[PDB]
Amino acid sequence: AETVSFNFNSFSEGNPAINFQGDVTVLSNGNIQLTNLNKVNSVGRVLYAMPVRIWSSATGNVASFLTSFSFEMKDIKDYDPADGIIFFIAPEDTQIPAGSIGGGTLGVSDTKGAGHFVGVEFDTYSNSEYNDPPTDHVGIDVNSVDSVKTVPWNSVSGAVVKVTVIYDSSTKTLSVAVTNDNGDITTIAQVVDLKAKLPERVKFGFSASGSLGGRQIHLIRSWSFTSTLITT
Amino acid sequence: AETVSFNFNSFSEGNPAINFQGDVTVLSNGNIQLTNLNKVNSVGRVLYAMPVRIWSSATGNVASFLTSFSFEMKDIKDYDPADGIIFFIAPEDTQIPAGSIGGGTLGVSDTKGAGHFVGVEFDTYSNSEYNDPPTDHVGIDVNSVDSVKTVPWNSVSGAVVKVTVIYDSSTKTLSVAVTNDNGDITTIAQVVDLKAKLPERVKFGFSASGSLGGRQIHLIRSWSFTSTLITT
Amino acid sequence: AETVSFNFNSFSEGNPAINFQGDVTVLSNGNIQLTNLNKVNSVGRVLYAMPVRIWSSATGNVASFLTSFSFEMKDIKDYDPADGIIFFIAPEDTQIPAGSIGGGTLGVSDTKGAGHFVGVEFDTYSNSEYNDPPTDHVGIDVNSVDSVKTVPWNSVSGAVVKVTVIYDSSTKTLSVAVTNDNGDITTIAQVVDLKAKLPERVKFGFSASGSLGGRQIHLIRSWSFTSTLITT
Amino acid sequence: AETVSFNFNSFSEGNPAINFQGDVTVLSNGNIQLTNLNKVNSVGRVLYAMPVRIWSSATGNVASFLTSFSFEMKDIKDYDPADGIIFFIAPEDTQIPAGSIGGGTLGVSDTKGAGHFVGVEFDTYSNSEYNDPPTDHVGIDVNSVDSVKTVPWNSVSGAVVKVTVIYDSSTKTLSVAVTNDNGDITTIAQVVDLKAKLPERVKFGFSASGSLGGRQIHLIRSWSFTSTLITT
Ligand SMILES: [Ca+2]
Ligand SMILES: [Ca+2]
Ligand SMILES: [Ca+2]
Ligand SMILES: [Ca+2]
Ligand SMILES: [Mn+2]
Ligand SMILES: [Mn+2]
Ligand SMILES: [Mn+2]
Ligand SMILES: [Mn+2]
Numbered sequence: 001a002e003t004v005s006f007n008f009n010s011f012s013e014g015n016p017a018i019n020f021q022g023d024v025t026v027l028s029n030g031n032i033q034l035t036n037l038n039k040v041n042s043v044g045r046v047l048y049a050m051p052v053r054i055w056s057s058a059t060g061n062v063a064s065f066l067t068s069f070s071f072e073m074k075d076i077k078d079y080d081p082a083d084g085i086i087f088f089i090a091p092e093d094t095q096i097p098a099g100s101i102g103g104g105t106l107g108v109s110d111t112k113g114a115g116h117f118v119g120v121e122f123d124t125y126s127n128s129e130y131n132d133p134p135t136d137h138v139g140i141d142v143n144s145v146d147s148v149k150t151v152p153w154n155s156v157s158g159a160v161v162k163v164t165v166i167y168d169s170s171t172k173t174l175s176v177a178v179t180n181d182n183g184d185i186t187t188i189a190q191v192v193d194l195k196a197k198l199p200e201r202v203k204f205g206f207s208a209s210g211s212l213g214g215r216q217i218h219l220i221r222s223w224s225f226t227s228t229l230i231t232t
Numbered sequence: 233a234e235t236v237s238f239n240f241n242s243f244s245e246g247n248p249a250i251n252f253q254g255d256v257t258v259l260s261n262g263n264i265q266l267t268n269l270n271k272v273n274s275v276g277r278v279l280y281a282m283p284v285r286i287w288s289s290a291t292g293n294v295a296s297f298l299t300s301f302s303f304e305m306k307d308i309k310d311y312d313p314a315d316g317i318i319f320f321i322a323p324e325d326t327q328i329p330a331g332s333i334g335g336g337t338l339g340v341s342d343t344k345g346a347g348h349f350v351g352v353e354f355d356t357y358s359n360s361e362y363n364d365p366p367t368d369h370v371g372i373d374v375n376s377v378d379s380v381k382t383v384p385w386n387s388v389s390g391a392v393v394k395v396t397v398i399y400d401s402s403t404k405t406l407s408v409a410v411t412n413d414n415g416d417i418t419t420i421a422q423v424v425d426l427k428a429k430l431p432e433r434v435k436f437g438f439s440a441s442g443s444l445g446g447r448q449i450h451l452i453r454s455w456s457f458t459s460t461l462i463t464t
Numbered sequence: 465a466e467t468v469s470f471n472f473n474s475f476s477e478g479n480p481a482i483n484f485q486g487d488v489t490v491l492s493n494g495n496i497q498l499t500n501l502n503k504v505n506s507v508g509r510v511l512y513a514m515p516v517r518i519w520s521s522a523t524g525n526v527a528s529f530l531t532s533f534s535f536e537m538k539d540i541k542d543y544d545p546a547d548g549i550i551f552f553i554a555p556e557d558t559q560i561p562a563g564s565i566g567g568g569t570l571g572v573s574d575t576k577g578a579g580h581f582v583g584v585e586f587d588t589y590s591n592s593e594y595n596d597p598p599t600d601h602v603g604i605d606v607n608s609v610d611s612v613k614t615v616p617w618n619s620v621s622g623a624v625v626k627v628t629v630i631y632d633s634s635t636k637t638l639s640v641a642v643t644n645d646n647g648d649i650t651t652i653a654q655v656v657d658l659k660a661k662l663p664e665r666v667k668f669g670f671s672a673s674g675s676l677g678g679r680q681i682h683l684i685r686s687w688s689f690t691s692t693l694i695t696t
Numbered sequence: 697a698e699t700v701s702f703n704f705n706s707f708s709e710g711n712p713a714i715n716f717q718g719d720v721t722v723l724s725n726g727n728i729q730l731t732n733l734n735k736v737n738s739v740g741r742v743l744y745a746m747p748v749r750i751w752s753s754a755t756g757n758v759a760s761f762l763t764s765f766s767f768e769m770k771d772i773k774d775y776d777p778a779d780g781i782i783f784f785i786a787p788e789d790t791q792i793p794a795g796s797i798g799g800g801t802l803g804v805s806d807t808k809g810a811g812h813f814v815g816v817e818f819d820t821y822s823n824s825e826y827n828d829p830p831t832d833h834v835g836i837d838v839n840s841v842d843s844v845k846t847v848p849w850n851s852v853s854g855a856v857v858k859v860t861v862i863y864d865s866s867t868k869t870l871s872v873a874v875t876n877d878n879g880d881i882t883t884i885a886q887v888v889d890l891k892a893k894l895p896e897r898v899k900f901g902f903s904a905s906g907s908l909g910g911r912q913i914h915l916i917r918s919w920s921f922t923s924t925l926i927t928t
Contacts, residue, residue, distance in 0.1 A: 225276035
């Protein structure tokens with residue numbers, strides 16, 4: 001099999017294994033801060049530099065993967081805690097959409113919420129323009145921030161949140177488990193065919209954004225990942 | 233929400249939180265050895281002592297859970313490395329079946345391979361009587377050791393294996409991710425309705441067994457668990 | 465390390481982790497009401513259902529523990545605001561004393577004020593028979609409601625009180641910090657050798673009582689707990 | 697009674713309620729980073745600007761206090777994770793010792809490890825000149841870094857550690873409870889006569905230091921405090 005695995009206990013902005021896009025900044029404690037606090041419509045994205053072959057057009061096999069990460073979102077005075085973080089998967093040439101409005105597009109889609117990526121959002125602001133649930137929520141997005149499926153959640157300012165993700169290739173099921181700060185766990189699962197939605201080679205990463213009047217601290221603290229593709 | 237959570241980084245004799253059934257022994261290093269290498273048809277089981285309420289007849293909700301543990305199986309001179317470990321979920325009254333032959337029943341089934349439980353097995357011996365695949369394998373068992381779904385695998389003597397299971401209550405999906413010592417991961421997923429196969433209160437634990445001639449070391453090294461039921 | 469920890473932000477009817485004894489009620493809000501307002505000499509107690517092993521007889525170790533909870537007492541028309549709440553530790557077989565008069569026994573002692581427990585009381589009525597100080601008070605009780613030590617305090621009808629307690633195994637010091645409504649803190653500390661007054665396995669919980677004439681609302685709103693026993 | 701109370705969820709540089717001394721800096725996420733990873737004998741300290749009256753001259757009364765704070769220490773590549781953090785109480789005119797060597801003096805003592813203060817350390821490096829135990833430990837310092845009493849502990853890089861301190865005036869008892877990332881708790885308590893060791897008015901705070909070769913990220917994330925002095 002073809003296995004790809006890495007693990008970041010802390011990041012740095014001079015590492016060739018990480019692509020930075022937008023307002024991304026690495027702090028002295030090793031955390032990655034995706035948005036710029038005093039910047040209007042800020043957008044920041046981080047991507048594992050190396051593309052991962054998630055499927056083969058030769059065999060027809062699709063990879064299974066397991067990945068976990070921890071983030072922190074914190075309020076800043078006089079600003080609406082918005083807009084959220086999104087763990088996404090996209091073609092290897094992915095870029096911040098041209099003329100991005102940041103805000104509720106999460107840095108992955110255009111104005112009407114479309115784009116080419118599959119992902120899991122931790123949305124903290126309800127945009128009715130994207131059919132947002134009326135509360136903080138966790139959602140499964142397939143080429144659009146108009147979530148295929150959402151689950152009410154609760155973002156607690158200043159808390160370290162841990163996430164564990166499993167995609168089983170045979171059932172093509174993507175399931176998510178969020179351990180909150182009060183101990184409670186939140187899960188959400190959805191069947192997504194990666195082969196049909198994405199190309200053979202892709203890039204995984206995180207993206208956060210905000211608007212004018214809607215901003216908050218978006219930090220990524222750690223990240224480990226392992227994918228395995230059977231070559232037979 | 234109703235949450236149950238715990239974490240064992242080692243075990244000790246006399247902790248009211250754990251129930252021991254059969255040939256279980258607590259090693260001086262904090263590990264739990266499931267079977268007796270000197271007994272024929274050995275069976276050892278360990279359970280979280282408190283029943284967990286997995287679904288409510290009042291509301292109709294089903295809990296979601298995330299649990300992870302790691303184990304090790306090691307070969308012993310002269311005996312066939314058999315038969316394996318199984319993480320299971322059973323009614324509150326659960327006990328080692330009456331006339332257990334151990335062996336391929338894994339300590340949770342009768343002689344024909346039937347019982348009342350839902351569980352994940354790590355089978356190191358192929359029993360044609362239970363329709364086992366020809367190689368070591370990981371399997372999803374619903375009231376039978378004749379697995380509803382299996383996936384090839386390879387037990388390595390002395391290797392520590394780490395496992396992650398996520399049960400998403402809404403899709404009723406149970407997913408597993410196994411991390412071999414070599415780095416490659418193994419996954420298997422299956423929709424299993426817990427509300428349909430089990431009582432409101434259940435118990436969680438691990439079971440292992442052997443035969444005459446089929447024997448090996450079965451160790452549980454750690455276990456963490458968290459379940460959350462959306463209360464009324 | 466052998467650790468037990470739990471967190472109840474709210475309570476629910478039917479949870480396997482909570483034992484109710486006497487006049488206990490779970491309100492629609494998740495709060496627990498310890499006494500019945502229409503009953504003479506009412507008593508209600510709520511306990512963490514699992515026995516916790518506080519000291520080991522193998523090694524000579526006693527566990528340290530940190531617990532916090534919040535309660536509220538509130539006046540009811542025409543009745544004297546009595547008698548108070550008590551957070552206690554008792555042998556795992558603990559039960560409301562046979563033919564209990566409620567009142568100043570706080571539901572944990574007998575008519576003479578004796579019993580088998582260690583506890584911190586939030587006493588709202590002065591019982592000269594148990595040598596109560598003349599004002600409301602916080603007391604440390606060792607097998608009796610005639611406190612080993614008390615400190616004046618003031619109960620505010622409808623106020624949410626927060627309490628933190630730390631037991632340090634090495635010195636044997638039980639420390640209590642009470643945070644009133646007006647922000648003021650009240651403290652009390654006492655050396656109590658738990659290994660000499662209690663059995664290895666105990667249960668933790670809250671008890672409240674009233675009499676004819678003496679009645680008020682007794683609520684438990686939350687409770688978190690963590691104990692760690694050095695096993696080695 | 698005279699009560700002083702505050703609660704910080706994040707700190708800012710333009711805050712006159714806090715005194716910054718030494719290499720201290722405030723990150724964009726609101727954390728206080730006590731040391732400079734680039735400086736050789738970095739020393740950083742942060743003090744609550746307002747002096748607290750811990751005891752009275754008229755009445756021999758001492759104050760009781762309850763305080764809780766969280767921190768995070770993390771390793772940096774090519775440097776020994778040293779030297780630790782210390783919560784301390786000292787004269788209102790306190791300043792970093794002249795010609796401070798950082799290191800094992802924790803920024804509160806001179807070269808022989810002497811000074812005027814009373815504190816709780818989370819020492820991550822073993823200095824024999826100050827008779828340090830051989831492992832990571834928590835200690836009670838009374839005018840010296842050669843602890844009056846210590847307890848073994850473990851500092852986990854990247855982990856958020858919460859602490860709770862209660863000082864009870866009547867028993868003159870200081871006790872601490874540390875919650876590792878693990879769920880496990882460590883406690884330590886000691887009888888310190890605050891009126892015999894410190895002046896009427898004092899300042900509360902934290903300090904951290906490093907050496908050449910010994911350096912790590914030392915952060916303070918939050919801090920709440922309350923103290924009450926009976927003036928009768
Ligand atoms: Ca949105
Ligand atoms: Ca078998
Ligand atoms: Ca009384
Ligand atoms: Ca030191
Ligand atoms: Mn959304
Ligand atoms: Mn099988
Ligand atoms: Mn009393
Ligand atoms: Mn020291």
